[PDB]
Amino acid sequence: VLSEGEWQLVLHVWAKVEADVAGHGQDILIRLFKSHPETLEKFDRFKHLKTEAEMKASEDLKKHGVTVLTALGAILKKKGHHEAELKPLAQSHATKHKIPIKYLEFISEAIIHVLHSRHPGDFGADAQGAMNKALELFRKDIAAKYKELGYQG
């Protein structure tokens, strides 16, 4: 569940994201929606948005971008001991929002793309390797909770 050395690479990278949570959140959701159109359909609140331009202009979308990264920052900071925060999130995405585990992987990919575009020099292969493992650990712990509830798939 990651070495201390890899957790460090991740939070160093995340300290950086914190500088503009709003910009990064807006970019991550627009990229998830562009590459995987089906995920956009899961948000009643953003369906209306067709083009990239419209997505960018939506303040509400940017607001949501902040919610998501604030919650993910709370998880990552726990350095694996994130059960209290992951629980309510796993439960609401399974039973309320109805988000397949496959969409969590798609967003994990989105996150990586944005952190590489932005912070080119701070996100070397080594930081990307540690970041990948953190997201996968989050994804495994969610899927465990999904199964218990009868929504793994």
103 binds, among ligand HEM, ligand ND4, none (CB under 5 to 8 A by kind): ligand HEM
**Only segment of 30-38, 48-56, 59-67, 105-113 that touches ligand ND4 (CB under 6 A):** 59-67
Q: How far is the CB of 150 from ligand HEM (least distance, A)?
A: 19
Write down the H helix ranges in the chain: 4-17, 21-35, 37-40, 52-57, 59-77, 83-95, 101-117, 125-149
Q: How far is the CB of 135 from ligand ND4 (least distance, A)?
A: 13
Is residue 59 involved in binding ligand ND4 (CB under 6 A)? yes
Give the SS3 label for residue 120: coil
User: Known binding site for heme b: residues?
Assistant: 93
Is residue 62 involved in binding ligand ND4 (CB under 6 A)? yes
Report which of 75, 105, 99 is spatially closest to residue 149, judged by C-alpha positions.
99
Question: Distance between CA atoms of 42 and 45, rounded to whole angstroms?
Answer: 9
Note the residues at the interface with ligand ND4 (CB under 6 A).
1, 59, 62-63, 80, 124, 126-127, 141
